[PDB]
Amino acid sequence: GGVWRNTEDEILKAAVMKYGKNQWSRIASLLHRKSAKQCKARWYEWLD
Amino acid sequence: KEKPSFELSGALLEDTNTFRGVVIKYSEPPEARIPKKRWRLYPFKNDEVLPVMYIHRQSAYLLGRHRRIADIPIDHPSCSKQHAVFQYRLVEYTRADGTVGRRVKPYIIDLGSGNGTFLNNKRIEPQRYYELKEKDVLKFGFSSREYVLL
């Protein structure tokens, strides 16, 4: 999957800002849409 | 009344071997196969062999006076519908050193020709695998033929 929605992108940006970049599971535990691998992939791809 | 016969009828045989629109007799045995011999027919009816025949590819062989029944017609007015048809089959032949093997060869069998057949001044009879070898001058009809092959 991984549609890379807008609200998901904002949530990932907020997680990287507050939770951190080296905590993919902490962000995946508040998304419930993609895996931590996919989350870090979207962070390094578009949400960097 | 009922006319009881208790004899063999033709309906079972017709259903066993029926062509596209006709009956199909002279059913080859199940011991045959497709050969791979380096031999091809070179029919030159008047010392001019324009076409070429390599029967190792085809298993069904029909040259007769049936345009709709057989595979194709033939310009052989002295030929019947089903009189003689040679067929390649894996016959258990003894090699030169005695090593027996199922070698592919053409079986010599007469299909009940109306006027028989002849090849090099000799007619071939059924129920006996004649010495079928290469470089043979034959005919593809019942009465006679003025054409041969190699």
Partner: protein, 932 residues
């Protein structure tokens, strides 16, 4: 092979008649020339241009390739044996799921990635059928909604032209056919008049759905055909089904017959009466009369009791058919008469009288299957006759039946079984003569190890045995059937057990002798010992046998107990499952016979085997424990409640279906009956465990959970239960989420609602929309469950409902309307007029709304207010809206007026105000002004 004719179906009154004539005059000379002496027949330029659609051009490129392919016939024989970038195009548009290769030919137009070109625009917009058939569920729902909304826009012509080939897909799976049928139904629900020209085109694809093995699919096909017929006119449908009568394909004839039957069921018997009468009087061909008889039979079978008034008229259609020369027409007419009879309750015997004499006369000259058809017709007609003639009729038919008892024909066997079931049930049947004549052959010739294997044969034999036992007696049938109790055949054993069970249930086993009783006990034991297929036949049979034996089963009690113990020690799922089933079934007999030691031993074995991991065995053990608690008392049960309650507490998380159901039932019974051995902390823990049981995928589980929560509330107290329920964060809004509100209402009905009201009012102060909607739904359910008890809480529930009436959210307004409906239904006559008016003050603006749920709730609340607040106030509030100018306002007001006028038809006289009299109208009811 019979269904393969459906693959030979091509798409698309005088021209059709000439085409059928040409078809007949082409199907005649083929066998004509065949006697005088295919799909690959010759093709013509007209045939070639007609086969394929537009978008192609014949072009033999050189003048040598045509005479290169012309001798290809001879080139297949002589020269055949002789000497001898990275491009691709799938179908994605934005997602466009994978199209199968068979569907590639259908959706090929979408494979082209061209865009921005009108007619082609609509054709491409019609590519949503690809996403509907092949795609995810959300895409399917979206395509369904788009087709529902874009009906008139896309046009019915292109829709049918695109849907018909998809229905004819040779690779069309069951799900694809179901989706296509649903789409066709949705399209026919909107388009009404435009479906006329495509009537035949849609019927050609929809008829095979009727002739199918799937019962649900056949029902869907019948419903679709009925809707299609009701859409267009009966005359158009008759014109479409006209040429199918004389169709060569018999499958086409059966399809046309089913279609005519559906059209008669929809548009009515008499609407299709004269068409059928003209079809029956057709001297053109015997196939016509055969199709007519088949249509009559199918119409009767589908209509059932609807043929009562037109039956005599049906006789007028069928009277000239009995004299048919061809045996097929006579057989069809006999089947039709039998259908009209057996489908018809006793009535209209005179209407069939014209067919009475010849059929029996045909029994005299009966030979072959015609005798069977005549016997079936006579059997169907015998009960419709009176006793005087029925005596002679049965006395004459019984001899022919006995003569035909040795018929190898399975159809003759079924006909004889039906005739026995019909005739033996007559009052003029000799019991001793029946037992002398029909009983031994029915046991020998009818009862056989091969007959039971069939599906219809099994039910037929069961019905025949039941009727014979009810007619002649139970002891003879029992003696005939008990010998087969040890039958090696499982199906024959099940049939014998079902026959014995039906006999014992209908006649009663009091006639069972001592030797017969012992034989039946041995048979039941052998059957329970040999049960390969998991079926309730053996269990239900043992239960009925025990219930019939009563106290006479005490000698068989210990043998059954030993067998149950050995089976519990035997294979769990195979043996112990049936063992626990038999125990739970015979608990009543064991308690009735005073099996005290037996009950205690059973309880001990159940407490021992309760720790089994197999859910099938554990659930049956829990059910047997529940039955023992139902028979054995609480204090008298040897496995006391102190061990049962905490042991059954953690079993709620078993996650099995039957296990969860049995555990919920046992806990609920224990907490509703005893309610003492459970401690306060134990009750709290049980409630905390049952809170998790609401997430199941069943409804009965939720109902049992609500009942158990109510019992626990009645036992422990309201405070703790309401506190545990108030914590429902409602993660999901479905999966029994409102179930917490239902449990709150159950606790309020069991406990003092004075305690449950203000706690709920305080929990409603939370911010979450989920919690607010839950509080509203719980208040509505509580008011509905209380009813008369709400005479005091009306003034207390008024302001919260008035505040929630503010439409901040649609769900809030829906819950408000539902609470208003429940309150109006419950406050009937209790004197809550002020609260009703205060609620109506905020409920009236909710009339203007488009939500289906909100609209339904508003309508229900208006009905409840008219019931309680009265129709006078309802009309006073709906008066100005009647003659309003708008379309939507007038529509809503007219719906409200129709709702208020459906009931209260008598009280609308007074509420009707005095409207002044116009020039050409005197509307003022002057009689009402008559002052006495």
């Amino acid at each position: 092979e019979y269904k393969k004719h459906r693959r030979t179906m091509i798409i698309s009154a005088e021209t059709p008649r000439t085409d059928r004539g040409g078809d007949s005059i082409g199907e005649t000379p083929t066998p004509g020339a065949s006697k005088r002496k295919e799909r690959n027949r010759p093709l013509s330029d007209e045939e070639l241009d007609a086969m394929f659609p537009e978008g192609y051009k014949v072009l033999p490129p050189p003048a040598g390739y045509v005479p290169i392919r012309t001798p290809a016939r001879k080139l297949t024989a002589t020269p055949t044996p002789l000497g001898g970038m990275k491009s691709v195009n799938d179908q994605p548009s934005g997602n466009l799921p994978f199209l199968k290769p068979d569907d590639i030919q259908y959706f090929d137009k979408l494979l082209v990635d061209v865009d921005e070109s009108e007619e082609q625009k609509e054709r491409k917009i019609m590519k949503l059928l690809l996403k509907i058939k092949n795609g995810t569920p959300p895409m399917r729902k979206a395509a369904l909604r788009q087709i529902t909304d874009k009906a008139r826009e896309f046009g019915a012509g292109p829709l049918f032209n695109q849907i018909l080939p998809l229905l004819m897909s040779p690779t069309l799976e069951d799900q694809e056919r179901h989706l296509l049928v649903k789409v066709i139904d949705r399209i026919l629900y909107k388009l009404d008049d435009l479906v006329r020209p495509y009537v035949h085109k849609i019927l050609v694809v929809i008829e095979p759905l009727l002739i199918d093995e799937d019962y649900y699919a056949r029902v869907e096909g019948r419903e679709i055909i009925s809707n299609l017929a009701k859409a267009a006119g009966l005359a158009t449908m008759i014109s479409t089904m006209r040429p199918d009568i004389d169709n060569m394909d018999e499958y086409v004839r059966n399809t046309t017959a089913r279609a005519f039957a559906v059209v008669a069921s929809a548009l009515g018997i008499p609407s299709l009466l004269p068409f059928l009468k003209a079809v029956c009087k057709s001297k053109k061909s015997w196939q016509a009369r055969h199709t007519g008889i088949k249509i009559v039979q199918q119409i009767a079978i589908l209509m059932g009791c609807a043929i009562l008034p037109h039956l005599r008229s049906l006789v007028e259609i069928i009277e000239h058919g009995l004299v048919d020369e061809q045996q097929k027409v006579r057989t069809i007419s006999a089947l039709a008469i039998a259908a009209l009879a057996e489908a018809a309750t006793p009535y209209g015997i005179e209407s069939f009288d014209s067919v009475l004499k010849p059929l029996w006369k045909g029994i005299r000259q009966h030979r072959g299957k015609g005798l069977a058809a005549f016997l079936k017709a006579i059997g169907y007609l015998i009960p419709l006759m009176d006793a005087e003639y029925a005596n002679y009729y049965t006395r004459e038919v019984m001899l022919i039946l006995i003569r035909e008892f040795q018929s190898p024909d399975e159809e003759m066997k079924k006909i004889v079984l039906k005739v026995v079931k019909q005739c033996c049930g007559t009052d003029g049947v000799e019991a001793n003569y029946i037992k002398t004549e029909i009983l031994p052959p029915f046991f020998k010739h009818f009862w056989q190890h091969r007959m039971a294997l069939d599906r219809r044969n099994y039910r037929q034999l069961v019905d025949t045995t039941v009727e014979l036992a009810n007619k002649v007696g139970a002891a003879e049938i029992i003696s005939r059937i008990v010998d087969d109790l040890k039958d090696e055949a499982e199906q024959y054993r099940k049939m014998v057990m079902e026959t014995i069970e039906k006999i014992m249930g209908n006649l009663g086993a009091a006639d069972i002798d001592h030797k017969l009783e012992e034989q039946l006990i041995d048979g039941i034991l052998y059957a329970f010992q040999e049960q390969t297929t998991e079926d309730s036949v053996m269990l239900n049979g043992f239960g009925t046998v025990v219930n019939a034996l009563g106290k006479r089963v005490k000698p068989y009690l210990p043998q059954i107990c030993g067998t149950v113990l050995w089976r519990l020690n035997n294979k769990s799922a195979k043996v112990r499952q049936q063992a626990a089933d038999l125990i739970s079934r015979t608990a009543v007999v064991m308690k009735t016979c005073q099996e005290e030691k037996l009950m205690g031993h059973l309880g001990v074995v159940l407490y021992e085997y309760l720790g089994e991991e197999y859910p099938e065995v554990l659930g049956s053990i829990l059910g047997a424990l529940k039955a023992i608690v139902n028979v054995i008392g609480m204090h008298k049960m040897t496995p006391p409640i102190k061990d049962l309650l905490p042991r059954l507490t953690p079993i709620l998380k078993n996650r099995h279906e039957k296990v969860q159901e049995n555990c919920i039932d046992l806990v609920g019974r224990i907490a509703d009956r005893g309610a003492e051995y459970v401690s306060a902390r134990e009750w709290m823990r049980i409630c905390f465990e049952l809170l998790e049981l609401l997430k199941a995928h069943k409804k009965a589980i939720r109902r049992a959970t609500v009942n158990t929560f109510g019992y626990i509330a009645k036992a422990i107290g309201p405070h703790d239960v309401l506190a545990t329920l108030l914590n429902n964060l409602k993660v999901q809004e479905r999966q029994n989420r409102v179930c917490t509100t239902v449990a709150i209402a159950i606790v309020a009905e069991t406990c003092s609602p004075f305690t449950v009201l203000p706690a709920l009012m305080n929990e409603y102060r939370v911010p979450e929309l989920n919690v607010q909607n839950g509080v509203l739904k719980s208040l509505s359910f509580l008011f509905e469950y209380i009813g008369e008890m709400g005479k005091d809480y009306i003034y207390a529930v008024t302001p919260l409902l008035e505040d929630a009436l503010m439409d901040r959210d649609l769900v809030h307004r829906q819950t408000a309307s539902a609470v208003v409906q429940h309150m109006s239904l419950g406050v009937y006559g209790f004197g809550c007029e002020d609260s009703l008016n205060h609620l109506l003050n905020y409920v009236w603006p909710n009339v203007f709304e488009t939500s289906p749920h909100v609209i339904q709730a508003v309508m229900g609340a208006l009905e409840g207010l008219r019931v309680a607040i009265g129709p006078c106030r309802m009309l006073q509030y709906c008066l100005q809206g009647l003659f309003h100018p708008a379309r939507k306002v007038r529509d809503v007001y007219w719906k409200i007026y129709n709702s208020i006028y459906i009931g209260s038809q008598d009280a609308l006289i007074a509420h009707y105000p005095r409207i002044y009299n116009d020039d050409k109208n005197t509307y003022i009811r002057y009689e009402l002004d008559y002052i006495l």
